[PDB]
Amino acid sequence: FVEMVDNLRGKSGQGYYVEMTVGSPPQTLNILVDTGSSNFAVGAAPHPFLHRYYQRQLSSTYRDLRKGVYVPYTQGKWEGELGTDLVSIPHGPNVTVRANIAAITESDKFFINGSNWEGILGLAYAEIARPDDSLEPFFDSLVKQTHVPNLFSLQLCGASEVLASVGGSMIIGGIDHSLYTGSLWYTPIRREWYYEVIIVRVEINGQDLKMDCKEYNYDKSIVDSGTTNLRLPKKVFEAAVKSIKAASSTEKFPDGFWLGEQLVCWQAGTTPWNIFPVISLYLMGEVTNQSFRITILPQQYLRPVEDVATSQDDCYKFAISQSSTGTVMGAVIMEGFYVVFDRARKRIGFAVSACHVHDEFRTAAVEGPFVTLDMEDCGYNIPQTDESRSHHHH
Ligand SMILES: N#Cc1ccc(COC(=O)[C@H]2C[C@]3(CN2)C(=O)Nc2ccccc23)cc1
Numbered sequence: 001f002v003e004m005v006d007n008l009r010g011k012s013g014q015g016y017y018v019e020m021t022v023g024s025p026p027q028t029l030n031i032l033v034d035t036g037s038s039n040f041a042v043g044a045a046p047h048p049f050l051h052r053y054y055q056r057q058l059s060s061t062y063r064d065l066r067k068g069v070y071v072p073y074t075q076g077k078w079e080g081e082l083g084t085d086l087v088s089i090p091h092g093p094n095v096t097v098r099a100n101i102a103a104i105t106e107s108d109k110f111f112i113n114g115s116n117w118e119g120i121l122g123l124a125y126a127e128i129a130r131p132d133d134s135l136e137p138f139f140d141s142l143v144k145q146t147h148v149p150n151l152f153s154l155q156l157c158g159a160s161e162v163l164a165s166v167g168g169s170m171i172i173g174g175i176d177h178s179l180y181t182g183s184l185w186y187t188p189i190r191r192e193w194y195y196e197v198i199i200v201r202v203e204i205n206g207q208d209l210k211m212d213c214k215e216y217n218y219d220k221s222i223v224d225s226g227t228t229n230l231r232l233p234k235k236v237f238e239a240a241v242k243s244i245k246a247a248s249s250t251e252k253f254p255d256g257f258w259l260g261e262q263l264v265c266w267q268a269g270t271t272p273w274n275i276f277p278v279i280s281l282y283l284m285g286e287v288t289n290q291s292f293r294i295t296i297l298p299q300q301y302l303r304p305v306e307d308v309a310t311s312q313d314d315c316y317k318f319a320i321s322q323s324s325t326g327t328v329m330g331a332v333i334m335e336g337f338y339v340v341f342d343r344a345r346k347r348i349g350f351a352v353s354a355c356h357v358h359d360e361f362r363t364a365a366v367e368g369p370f371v372t373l374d375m376e377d378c379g380y381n382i383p384q385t386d387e388s389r390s391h392h393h394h
């Protein structure tokens, strides 16, 4: 898997993207790797924020599906024309796949100025593909047309006139043991739409937040590489911030800091890491009543930004934010861990990332098992609307 190692790039907080070619002749595009979605889609017309885009009509292998598509996120929104074409990853498997592609023709708050990506690779399941689950997602097609094992793994590596470059690896088709240390612990995928998982317990510096564990997973908990922050449901976010405020309280930051909207700085090299607590999420084990914990440092949740105007300082952004659609384990979480999307056995593994940022006193950790007698159910059941209910699945 050496040729796939380090095949991701980007700018800190703006998404990791992989290089892909679409069409014949091949057009190269930098594509956001996003496990929080299931569409493959590329900018397909000019845009202030795009250097380039996919030109359907310059590809001899393009087939129009004569079908339109619309995907609204909440923070985002794009639409386009559905088609298929030949697709490959230069720093991936040595294969070419015919896959569905959405040619994006209009968008809003989707593309990111400076991010250097021109599309999105949705690696989640067909259930959340648009317009429906009959649109075969990229990964399904790849596994189905080639011999590629039904598994991929992600190692995202965290970091004056530009934001910091990041590097990552997406290993398509297996697990590169050089990308982690220690044990790989697996949590069941609750349902196959998002990479939904179940958190059973949260600790801030050893201290249990003591909430009904259902609050952790309200209304779901997902692993999303295409989300920058660790995002937490309102109740959970407030309790977590309270505890972090409290451990870090020899330092009094502005509201805007905790709201993720403002940098705080120290003299270069003098950041008092150790006044910031570790955060541990306990995840449901493969064995009933078992859990393991993934433990991140302030080096994951405190995100470096070089101030143009105080460039002599180390400055940081708080990259834990509030959610109203559940817990999102975003890059902040992922950048502690080598994460294994084991679709074949319907599970997600975490191990300590050989590239995670740490210090001489603490590291990100993956630890288990932990055991609960008569463990309750921490899963939430999303209310079923009539729209959703009325859909057939043939
Ligand atoms: N019909 C639908 C449908 C499908 C999936 C989702 C959920 O999509 C995600 O979570 C993806 C997309 C993402 C980050 N991850 C986002 O939300 N905005 C944004 C902006 C830019 C890049 C990536 C993203 C919501 C609705």
Ligand SMILES: [Zn+2]
Pocket: 392, 393, 394
């Ligand atoms: Zn029917």
